[PDB]
């Protein structure tokens, strides 16, 4: 049937770095959210502007699914009005955000003996991201008055760094896969109408 293509997002084998988060637009389908809000496999299930229990009785024009990987202690920054290198330089939610933030521990898949460094984040930026803005630039960060001329050096930093996901690490320094659902309702007819 016309089931919403969730699971292509949640159960995906590869997840994006936070600085380069993936967005999927979803429409013209029915969605059983109960697979989500009835699952004990999620560490964080926080919805802003809506209660997940009422989602299966609602109808939206479009649903946007954002997904990435960060550390445990950073999941608190995936929320309206938060501060941090993640909330400010990588992924920012608006003040009027309606949607849900779901996360789970992924140490089993996203860490390796010796450390997995394939997951990257943005450490420096000249200005905070606007809500839902994305920045996949690799322009050298100028921390001083000397122009960098595109070359790394003194007070000329590469803006990206990688995480170090070791299997034995503490829970807060372990990888967590995050999925953010955004709900937009227009005057056009609602096509994401899960029962």
């Amino acid at each position, epitope marked *: 049937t016309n089931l919403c293509p969730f699971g292509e997002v949640f159960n995906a084998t590869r997840f994006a770095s936070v600085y380069a988060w993936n967005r999927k637009r979803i429409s013209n389908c029915v969605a059983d959210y109960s697979v989500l809000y009835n699952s004990a496999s999620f560490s964080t299930f926080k919805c*802003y502007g*809506v209660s997940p*229990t009422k989602l299966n009785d609602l109808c939206f024009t479009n649903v946007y699914a954002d997904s990435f990987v960060i550390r445990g*202690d950073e999941v608190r*920054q995936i*929320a309206p*009005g938060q501060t941090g290198k993640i909330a400010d330089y990588n992924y920012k939610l608006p003040d*009027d955000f309606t949607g849900c933030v779901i996360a789970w521990n992924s140490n089993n898949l996203d860490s390796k003996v010796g450390g997995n460094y394939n997951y990257r984040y943005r450490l420096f930026r000249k200005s905070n991201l606007k809500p839902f803005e994305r920045d996949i630039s690799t322009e050298i960060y100028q921390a001083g008055s000397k122009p960098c001329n595109g070359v790394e050096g003194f007070n000329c930093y590469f803006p990206l760094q990688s995480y170090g996901f070791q299997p034995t690490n503490g829970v807060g320094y372990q990888p967590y896969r995050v999925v953010v659902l955004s709900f937009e309702l227009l005057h056009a007819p609602a096509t994401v109408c899960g029962p």
Partner: antibody
Amino acid sequence: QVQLQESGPGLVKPSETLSLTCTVSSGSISGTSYYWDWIRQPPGKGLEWIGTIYYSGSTYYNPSLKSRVTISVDTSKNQFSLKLSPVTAAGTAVYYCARRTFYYDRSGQKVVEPFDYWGQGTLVTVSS
Amino acid sequence: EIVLTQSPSTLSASVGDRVTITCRASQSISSWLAWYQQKPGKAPKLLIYEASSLENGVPSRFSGSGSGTEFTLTISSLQPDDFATYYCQQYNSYSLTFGGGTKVEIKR
């Protein structure tokens, strides 16, 4: 980050109105998942919550101070305000405004976090 | 209605010592307890949420434990910058209430 700033007259005569206003910058008072609060600290003593407001105008007040408290909000100036109508000697305090964020449970219940953001605090003396 | 009682009222210790403040509740508040530090003249700063979880930026020498009606905040190695007065607060109920505070002085 968002900034909170308390403003108001620092001196009030007893049995008159204490009035303070909190201006929000680098952020919206109209955020859907925020609660906006007033707290006070009498000098040398502890902290006491007064009331909370939502951008729509809904209020919840401390039962001890209900008789004298009115909290309003004006989304167009990004401000919310406090009014203590018959102020007493207990009104002498440093007054703070603060923000909390709230979300809904997997169970559907509401969860409101503690106070993340505070103003600088303004002292108000109750005196003749 | 819910009363949070803090112990000790005052605490003086040397640098590097372990110190521990106690927050006792008149009723069960589950894990909905926060801890703030207030250095004099300034606003309270959130240190711990949900009794054991640490807010971003707070140094790791700060820890909290507890559930039900008894809670603790523990500083593993007291540092000179930790002279603040510390407060516990329950966000479990509609009427938010604070502790009486514990003043922490450094001995030298």
